[PDB]
């Protein structure tokens, strides 16, 4: 999940 969100940055 971290990756899925972190892609914003
Ligand atoms: C949420 O975005 C997310 C993405 C990817 C993973 C994840 C966990 C483990 C591996 C892996 O190859 O482990 C080898 C032991 C790959 N991707 N978790 C959460
Ligand atoms: N929000 N985006 C990021 O923080 C981000 C981190 C890392 C990367 C990225 C891109 C390309 C490579 C590579 N060619 O190995 C590695 N990491 N993009 C975005
Ligand atoms: C620039 C756009 C894609 C954005 C990225 C992160 C946070 C807010 C907007
Ligand atoms: C440089 C551009 C393609 C970008 C990369 C990662 C996150 C937001 C924009």
């Amino acid at each position: 999940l971290a990756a899925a969100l972190a892609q914003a940055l």
Side-chain angles (χ1 to χ4, degrees), residues 1-6:
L1 179 56
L5 309 179

